[PDB]
Design a protein around this ligand. Sequence first.
Ligand SMILES: CCCCCCSC[C@H](NC(=O)CC[C@H]([NH3+])C(=O)O)C(=O)NCC(=O)O
Ligand SMILES: CCCCCCSC[C@H](NC(=O)CC[C@H]([NH3+])C(=O)O)C(=O)NCC(=O)O
Lengths: 209, 209
Amino acid sequence: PPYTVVYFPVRGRSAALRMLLADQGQSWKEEVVTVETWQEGSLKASALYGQLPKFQDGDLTLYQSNTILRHLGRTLGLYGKDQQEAALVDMVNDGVEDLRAKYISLIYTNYEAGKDDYVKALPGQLKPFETLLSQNQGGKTFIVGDQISFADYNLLDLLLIHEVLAPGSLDAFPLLSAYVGRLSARPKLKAFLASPEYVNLPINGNGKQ
Amino acid sequence: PPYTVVYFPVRGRSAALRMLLADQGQSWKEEVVTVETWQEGSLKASALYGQLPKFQDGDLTLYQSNTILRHLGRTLGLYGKDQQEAALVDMVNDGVEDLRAKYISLIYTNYEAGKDDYVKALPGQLKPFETLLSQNQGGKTFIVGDQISFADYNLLDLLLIHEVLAPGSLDAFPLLSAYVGRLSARPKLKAFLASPEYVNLPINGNGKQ
Ligand SMILES: CCCCCCSC[C@H](NC(=O)CC[C@H]([NH3+])C(=O)O)C(=O)NCC(=O)O
Ligand SMILES: CCCCCCSC[C@H](NC(=O)CC[C@H]([NH3+])C(=O)O)C(=O)NCC(=O)O
């Protein structure tokens, strides 16, 4: 630390890292980049893949949302208790990333045309996270082990946004409904999710949710 | 260990994790899964995300290619010498991953109508790794730091398949170029890249490369 998130006035691929910081009792600066600022071409030109988020941690500069997440898991001890759990944390997040890339591509690339095909495939896509949960202490704690990981935040954000896209898509998944239900209640995380820092922001950058 | 890779008879997403093992002088078994056996559906059904590659390491069963990359870097010490190097290695891999997604979506979804545009875009897509490899002792060792990482096996394969795509695609990048020969000159890799079980193996499995 200190932490700075440099991003568009959208939740997008920073919603989960932001949650993590907040749940962890941490504080950060929000650097905001409007499309106008981005349209200047100054930020993009330095950015390693011409894309945001950008994260500064003390004197360390990072791109890629999952790098940032992994770096915070590695520093705040949110990467499982051991080398097995490390691997299972990854498996979970890689799975989140896969569904998220699908979600993004629907939203930005063809929303109204694909929504039906997307939401149809959704139960099949959520079932492995129910399974995962049911194979660890009975879905009673976290997605991996019995302490919180970066994969938990990234997955929490995945389900929240999906409840907006497809109201009631978690009915069929009891363990997962209680898990969003429980993890939201975590005191600092309740507060963060109610902050205008979050609430004032739309999920996506194109009107679509 | 011991190691087992379960996958279709292609290079695909088990290509980078096999170079790693070979160069690391390690050995492994192959569970070949033809398309016809996959259509039977009992393997599909048991896989966490219904997909391959699948990997067994001693008692651990893993899915997700980068998870197997990460698991391997962590056990064999191919994840940078420190915390910062770790975060940059992930930054490379995520960037490799992003170009692999796009190539995979060219190969399987619109090869015939996508290609000229794709190769058109290749230089300005390969440049980010040319940069990183510059800002790291002038390009003379590895993508990150001075010892090999899982991010180097993944990028190396990414660069090899793209040479098959458009032969001579790497000339506008003389740095990324010698990188490829350095890594393939490594006696353990060299020999595997000359074995049939690498040369006789299809890249993508749909007659397109
Ligand atoms: C312009 C409004 C965009 C706001 C929507 C979300 S950011 C979209 C895009 N960034 C990304 O796709 C980030 C992906 C990156 N691989 C990650 O996971 O962090 C971007 O910076 N795009 C700009 C560019 O690539 O030039
Ligand atoms: C004909 C030979 C083709 C083999 C190459 C395709 S393997 C493609 C697919 N696997 C994946 O997309 C893996 C994605 C995963 N995110 C990873 O990187 O490990 C799969 O198991 N697909 C099968 C399915 O989903 O039914």
